[PDB]
Design a protein around this ligand. Sequence first.
Ligand SMILES: [Mn+2]
Ligand SMILES: [Mn+2]
Length: 271
Amino acid sequence: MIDLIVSQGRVADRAAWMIEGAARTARALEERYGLKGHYVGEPAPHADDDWSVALPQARETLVAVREAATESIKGDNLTVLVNNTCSVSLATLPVVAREHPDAVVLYIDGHGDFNTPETTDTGYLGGMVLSGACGLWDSGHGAGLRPEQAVLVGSRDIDEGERELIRKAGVRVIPPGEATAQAVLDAVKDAPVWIHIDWDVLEPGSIPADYTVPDGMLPAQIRAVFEAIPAERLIGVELAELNAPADSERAEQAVAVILDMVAPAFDAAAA
Ligand SMILES: [Mn+2]
Ligand SMILES: [Mn+2]
């Protein structure tokens, strides 16, 4: 009852290993849950190109992800996308909002990803994902997601300009220290739920985390969200931006933490 879709095409990647990180994540879920992913797109080297150039490079991959996610959302399974970058979601979130206008999008991310072409400092498409899906600029892949239905979770240290775009559009923000399971549940109400996770929301690992207050979200906070969202209400889950090299020990240790965080939702969906 899980539909696993994996992006392997470049969508504006500026980091070197997020396509490999996607591949390693999908593999772990394949082995644990007895699935075989639908892989989409052809890998390409990362680059520091303007969104105006990277977005058209990505059209083929984005279109094929849209078709595969659309297929999945209209079915009866849990839709799980393992994405190299958040920018893949320029294709999926408009589908989510059209099939499920009442869906709340939990955009879990250390950043706001709410830049527009006029406000971006870096030109990075990954920083314009939620604003594009909400229609503040036109990505060429649709919009229709109400900002009132989007909730940023774990975001912090947002640029004052971008924080005002977020505020004016009506996107709620729940910082890591407020991001308990109940706070998230209270933001969702009865609605069906789409979960999008950029792993940079996570606190950089501390083994003795005992006496410091973390700035990012902890894995246990991610797991509690997945434990708290009722299975009948979960539309799907996007896992994005694991930057870890193929065959590396680090990728192996990374996907073990991911599988522990996602296990409550995926185990419920599997049976
Ligand atoms: Mn992101
Ligand atoms: Mn981020």
